[PDB]
Each structure stands twice: as structure tokens, then as C-alpha cells.
């Protein structure tokens with residue numbers, strides 16, 4: 001049965017016209033099946049036999065009894081654009097705990113909604129013959145596979161659930177694709193009655209809902225999750241055992257392993273990723289190293305763990321704690337009651353050209369914060385492994401606007417600290433190294449050195465170098481040769497950057513070397529002066 | 533209704549909605565449900581692909597739609613009282629409700645399409661579009677132009693002294709009367725309008741002030757010289773020759789260096805050259821106004837408004853508001869609103885900002901503190917060390933104010 005709902009006015013993109021694609025020829029066996037299938041739809045009021053006046057046409061196909069398959073790629077290419085059919089998918093940690101939740105599959109509902117009569121002509125398709133004129137039809141409802149069907153269907157479903165919603169504010173209905181998830185804290189008999197009120201209501205509008213054979217029941221498979229009444233879990237993850245792995249198998253594997261590091265703690269893929277070096281083909285067989293066998297081995301044990309979370313309780317705190325797993329790597333868990341996580345995560349090692357741990361920390365906070373506002377419409381209380389004084393010292397004197405929402409300190413090592421702090425003023429009684437680096441940027445042959453006020457000096461000849469690198473090496477040497485307290489003078493523009501940012505990690509091996517040196521000193525003061 | 537059009541070849545805005553907090557979403561739903569009732573907005577379908585972001589600000593919640601994109605794509609329309617910047621005092625008035633009465637071309641409405649997001653993507657957004665002139669839209673003040681003169685003519689004429697300028701939803705009222713008498717003339721206008729705290733002159737431009745040292749050290753000269761060198765891009769007459777000569781050798785960074793008489797003079801000529809803004813800088817309508825902000829720290833911010841590099845139209849300093857201490861993002865938005873407001877007052881257009889903040893950071897929290905009916909354009913940048921050091925040298929009140 002078709003729905004007595006008004007149509008949405010559709011149009012073809014700017015200027016272009018309906019498709020005129022040629023009908024791929026078929027076997028009597030197939031044409032036969034299509035004729036039958038279509039007769040049914042014509043009967044059901046889904047398609048309409050039309051004449052030759054229609055210059056448009058889309059190719060029809062037969063798959064496996066048989067099933068019709070119309071190819072609208074062309075039409076979709078000429079069909080106007082619609083609203084972003086809700087691109088954001090719901091996360092289990094954001095579903096509110098409910099006494100009862102029911103799933104209502106409103107699938108074949110693409111064929112349940114009317115098509116803008118003005119647009120139906122473009123949907124014309126043709127059933128072959130054994131040759132002679134084939135049988136011609138056009139759709140009277142949203143064609144499965146057509147560009148606007150998803151959006152129009154969802155728009156339609158929304159109008160329909162409008163009254164019911166106003167009449168049952170206790171009840172909550174989620175809309176996702178061809179499905180309705182209806183939940184409430186009503187007594188199970190009451191819930192059931194309202195569900196039936198709804199089926200009947202959707203029915204009223206031409207939307208057949210499941211029968212006892214299609215009805216789904218808990219737990220529910222949701223994008224790799226198993227939703228139970230009082231908790232969710234993740235569908236078991238499978239690691240294919242083999243005695244022969246190709247490049248493709250390994251990447252595939254890394255992919256799944258990477259996804260699991262989010263939920264599971266302890267997943268590693270370094271030795272496995274190592275296997276991808278210099279690969280020549282996807283089918284190429286790569287032998288697993290010992291470390292790789294071990295890795296893959298321990299991971300299997302980790303995935304055999306019962307990792308579960310709980311649902312949202314809008315009346316309790318929303319807490320988010322963070323840890324620094326390693327340099328650039330961060331882990332987090334968002335919970336309300338201790339140990340009962342709503343969700344957990346991990347943030348891949350960002351390889352920024354130059355940054356510091358306190359920065360990366362605030363960046364993690366922000367991602368989590370954005371993520372939270374999306375999932376819960378609120379932003380968490382943060383428990384960060386950084387002292388308030390450490391935060392106070394860095395932020396107030398950092399060239400960039402930065403911030404962290406309400407947070408508290410949690411002493412769960414390793415803590416995030418400042419690896420060093422350039423002196424505010426020159427150091428008294430500290431050697432002063434006047435460093436300098438120059439190089440023929442063309443021949444890439446340069447020299448790096450210094451001259452301290454105490455009479456100490458040095459110069460190094462470097463080949464295959466860049467001016468930036470000589471200047472940087474200049475500084476490295478100074479730090480290297482200086483004592484635990486040094487004053488360094490450079491006309492390097494990049495160093496000017498270090499003075500402002502005071503990075504503790506970067507892309508340059510040189511800078512990294514310098515940072516180690518910087519960290520090691522007890523007092524370092526960097527001064528910049530114009531070149532020449 | 534007057535038929536409004538997009539600029540030639542310009543298609544409608546299809547900007548995505550940023551996620552909102554539940555609190556803010558509930559608010560907009562209430563606000564919009566009412567507007568719907570009053571036929572100010574109407575729900576739309578999927579056939580409308582356009583979209584403009586929306587959010588809530590500030591006590592109750594106010595709706596604010598980010599039409600920046602639609603404004604750019606909206607056709608142009610057919611004066612700035614340069615006397616506004618001179619008045620001793622000006623008050624800003626929110627005349628946005630004015631537009632709700634005027635209907636909007638039906639053919640243009642689809643472009644005003646906005647969306648109220650839903651927590652955790654559990655349900656689709658609630659799409660609406662406007663029937664009447666919206667707040668924050670370029671065309672609204674434009675269309676309602678004739679009607680705003682009519683209601684203003686009397687008041688203006690009656691007080692041919694007071695100057696009134698209109699920008700977007702705001703009305704800027706400039707006068708010279710004393711406080712009370714001012715607020716009085718304002719309420720007089722209000723009332724007049726209810727039936728249908730800036731000080732421009734006080735904004736003196738501040739000069740750079742080179743440090744005054746009892747005795748200078750090698751470092752003091754190195755820093756002083758770096759700043760001057762750089763600053764030579766603004767004042768070509770600045771010299772650091774004699775200073776750089778005192779900098780010969782390999783002395784301890786802390787060693788005191790006695791200044792020769794040339795260095796003395798050089799610095800003296802330099803101080804004079806800095807006594808006044810550079811000659812030859814004038815505003816150009818054909819060009820964009822640019823606002824650059826540098827975080828100086830300790831709650832201090834320095835900014836510069838200009839259209840051509842090194843040719844500032846204005847420069848300044850902003851100190852965080854009370855109770856804005858732990859929030860960098862808050863201080864900056866408050867700074868933007870203040871700089872943007874002065875810009876409007878002075879030039880009648882908003883400037884584009886160069887914000888020393890990371891895109892993500894700003895976009896996540898700036899609306900929590902925004903309070904203007906308008907929104908300027910912005911880009912995020914990486915402050916050059918020297919530019920910061922330079923404007924940190926700006927002069928300040930003997931005691932205060």
C-alpha cells in the first residue's frame with residue numbers, strides 16, 4: 001500500500017535533462033522474470049505502464065528466484081541535490097538508558113512513498129523483448145537506488161511521526177535509515193501497547209511494519225556493537241589465523257587492529273606495520289618476523305577480553321579522564337560512575353612540524369569536547385594528568401590563544417610537564433655562545449660554529465646541508481659544548497620560533513637533537529639578533 | 533515585497549551546522565516553535581539543499597544565524613556619518629526585531645534555510661527557512677531602508693545634533709550631551725521605536741615607546757636593535773648603525789656597554805621618529821579592512837587595523853574583562869567584538885581578522901561568549917615573534933584613566 005502523504009517537488013539539476021540510456025539486451029529467462037515482477041508492482045500501484053512519448057529511459061537488470069535492479073546512476077547524475085541525509089551516525093555511549101527499546105523496520109518503505117508526479121517521467125525504464133517493442137514503465141513511488149529516495153523517505157517519516165511524538169513526550173524515537181528505534185521507561189506492557197499504537201499509526205499512512213518473522217530482538221547489532229538492555233559490548237573481533245600473509249592481508253589486518261585500539265587497551269601494530277616496507281604488490285607474500293608473530297599473538301589475547309560500556313544517564317556527571325600513553329599518543333575514557341565507561345578512545349601520534357605536550361594535551365581535550373557535544377550535547381568535567389600550576393605557567397605565556405574547559409588534576413603518571421623553560425633574561429656568569437651557520441644553498445656545503453665570550457670556539461664543515469640546518473647545528477654545537485647554563489646568540493629566524501613556542505618535539509632530527517640538549521641544561525637563554 | 537536576487541552566478545549557501553549543546557538546542561527549538569506559530573519561519577523539506585548555520589547567545593537565550601555566506605552571495609544595494617567617530621558618546625541599539633514585520637521575497641526564502649541539530653544524531657535536524665526579513669542578513673537592513681528613515685526623520689530633525697548610523701541589526705547613536713542627558717535622548721528614541729556605551733573621541737592612537745635604560749647591557753641593545761630593525765619597515769628613517777657598532781665583539785650577554793654620543797643621538801632621532809604615526813596613511817573603500825591580533829600574555833592583547841601592511845589606520849591594546857582570566861578564547865572574542873565595533877563606528881564596515889588561535893579551538897568555543905548581532909570574517913594565523921615584541925612597546929597612561 002502506497003502512502004497518502006503529499007509529494008516533495010523534485011527537479012533535475014541545472015539545465016540538464018532526464019536520462020536516455022539504452023536498455024541492455026536480456027535473455028528470455030530474464031525478460032520473463034522482469035515481466036512478472038513488474039506486473040506485481042504495476043498491480044500494487046508502484047509502477048505505471050507508459051507509452052513511447054517518454055524519450056527518457058533507464059536500464060533494468062535481473063539478479064539472483066530473480067530480483068529486478070534498475071540503474072539510476074544516470075538519473076542521479078541529473079537529479080538535483082538534497083539535504084545532507086543526516087550524515088552523522090549515533091554512538092551507543094550517547095543512547096539514554098531506557099526500560100524498553102523496540103526496533104521498527106520500515107524498509108520497503110522506499111516503495112511506500114509517492115514520487116513527485118512531475119518527476120516520474122525521468123524514471124522511465126524498459127523491459128526487453130525476444131527485437132520488437134519492449135514493455136515500458138515509470139515509477140509512481142521512490143525508486144530504490146535513486147538519489148532522492150533516502151532524503152524524501154526520511155522527510156516523510158518525520159512528518160508522520162510528528163503528531164505521535166507530541167502525544168507521547170515520554171517516548172523517544174530515533175530515526176536512522178529505514179529504521180525506527182523506540183524506547184521508554186514505561187512498564188513493559190505499556191511500552192508494548194504504544195509500540196502497537198505506532199505500528200497501527202504508521203500503518204494508517206501506508207507503512208507496513210515487520211511481522212513476527214522479521215522482528216529483531218536484543219541484543220542488537222549496531223555498527224559492530226551488541227546492545228544489551230543495560231550495557232553494550234562490541235561484536236567479537238576476528239583475527240584470521242594463516243601460514244601465508246600477503247601485503248593485502250597485512251594492511252587489512254592493521255586496519256582492523258587500528259580500529260580496535262579505540263576500545264581495547266594494549267593493541268600494537270608496529271612490528272606488523274614494519275612488514276609493509278618496500279612491498280611490491282598486494283598479493284606479495286610477506287613472512288612474519290618473530291616480533292610480528294608475537295605482536296599478532298598478544299593482540300589475539302587482548303581481543304578475547306569482554307570490553308563493555310554502559311548507556312547515558314542524563315542526571316549524573318559526565319567525566320572524562322586522559323592519560324599520555326606515549327609521546328604524541330593519548331588515551332581517554334568518558335564515564336559517569338567510576339569504571340562504568342560510556343566510551344573510550346585513543347588519539348594517534350600527531351606528527352606536527354613542531355609542538356609540545358601541553359599543546360597536544362589541549363588538542364586532545366578539544367577533540368573529546370567536540371565529540372561529547374555531539375554525542376551528549378554537553379561537555380565533560382576533565383581529569384587531566386597535568387598540574388594546575390603547569391597549566392597556568394604555559395598557557396598564560398603562550399603566543400596562541402588556548403584553553404581547557406572545567407578540569408581538575410589527577411595524579412596518574414606519567415604526567416604532562418614542560419620539558420624546559422627558556423630564561424626570561426640573560427644568565428649571569430654563564431658562557432655566551434655567539435653561534436652562526438652558513439651554507440651554499442646550491443652546493444649544499446656549509447659551516448657551523450660559535451665563539452664564546454670566554455674565548456672558546458669551533459667550526460664544522462658540513463656537506464649536503466641546508467642553511468637552516470647549519471644555523472640549527474650552530475646552536476646544537478653550542479648546547480653540546482656549553483655547560484649546564486648557557487646564553488646563546490643566533491640570527492636564525494627559526495630559533496626565533498623556538499623562543500616563542502619552546503617545542504618538545506618536531507619533524508626535524510636536528511631540532512629534536514637540540515631539544516634533547518635544551519631539556520638537559522639547567523638554564524638556557526636564547527637571544528636573536530638581525531643577520532648582518 | 534521587493535524581489536531580491538543573489539549576485540550573478542552565485543548559488544545559495546550550503547554551510548554545515550556546527551554541533552550545539554543540549555541547552556542551546558532546546559532554546560532554539562522553543563524560539564523557532566514560536567516563530568513558526570507567528571508565521572515568521574516555516575519548516576522545509578529535503579528539496580531545499582541550502583543551509584546556513586545557527587546558534588544561541590545571550591537572562592534568556594537569543595537566536596543568532598550566521599548569514600556571513602548568504603550576505604556575500606546576496607546582490608548589492610543602494611552613507612557613513614564620519615561625524616560618528618568624533619561624538620563624545622555613542623550607544624548601540626538592537627533594532628533587529630524591526631525586520632520581522634516585513635515579508636521576504638518568496639523566491640529568495642529557500643536560501644535562508646537553516647537547521648537545528650539533534651543530540652547524537654538520533655533524529656534528523658529541524659529545517660526551517662524565513663518568510664520575513666531575517667536578522668543578520670545583508671538585505672534586511674537594506675529593504676527596511678525606507679521604513680527606518682521615516683521613523684527616524686522626526687527624532688533626527690528634532691535633534692539635528694545627534695548622529696545616527698545603522699549597521700546590520702544595530703543602530704549607533706552618536707551625541708555629545710553629558711551622560712544622563714545622553715541616556716535620556718536614547719530612551720527618547722527607544723520609546724519612539726518601542727512603538728512599532730562607547731566613547732569615540734577618547735580613542736587616542738598610542739605611540740611606540742622605546743625602552744629607557746639607566747645602563748644598557750649587550751642584550752638590551754640586541755633586543756632594542758632587533759625591534760628597531762624590524763620597525764624600519766614602517767619608519768624608514770630609523771637607524772641602528774651606531775647601536776650595531778656598540779654590538780661589535782663577543783661580550784657577555786650581560787656585560788654593560790657605555791653608549792657613544794652617536795648611539796645617543798641615533799636613539800634620540802629614533803625616538804622622535806616614533807613620536808607620531810607614519811605620514812600618508814588614508815582609508816580606501818575599494819579595499820578590505822584588516823584586523824590583526826597578537827596575544828601579549830597576562831591577559832594583554834595588541835591589535836592593528838590596516839589595509840596595506842605597515843600602514844596602520846589604527847593600532848591598540850586590550851586587557852581582559854573582569855572574570856575572563858582562565859579563558860583565552862573568551863578574552864579574544866571580547867577583543868574581536870570591541871575591535872569590530874570600533875571599525876563599524878569609524879568605517880561602517882567590519883574588518884577581516886587574523887586570529888592568533890587554532891581553527892578548531894576558536895570554532896569550538898567562540899559562540900559561548902559572542903554577543904553581537906553580527907559576525908566578522910576571520911582567518912587563523914601564526915604570530916611572528918617580532919611583530920608581538922614591537923607592539924608590546926606601545927605607550928600607556930602616566931597613571932591610568
Ligand SMILES: Cc1cc(S(N)(O)O)ccc1NC(=O)COc1ccc(Cl)cc1C(=O)c1cc(F)cc(C(F)(F)F)c1
Nearest residue numbers: 090095096097098099100101174181182183220227228229
Ligand atoms: C538495547 C535495549 C534493550 C531494552 S529491552 N529490555 O530489551 O527492551 C531496553 C533498553 C535498551 N537500550 C538502552 O537502554 C539504550 O538504548 C536505546 C535507548 C533509546 C532508544 Cl529509542 C533505542 C536504544 C537502542 O538500544 C538502539 C539500538 C539500535 F540497534 C540502534 C539505535 C540507534 F540507531 F538509535 F542508535 C539505538
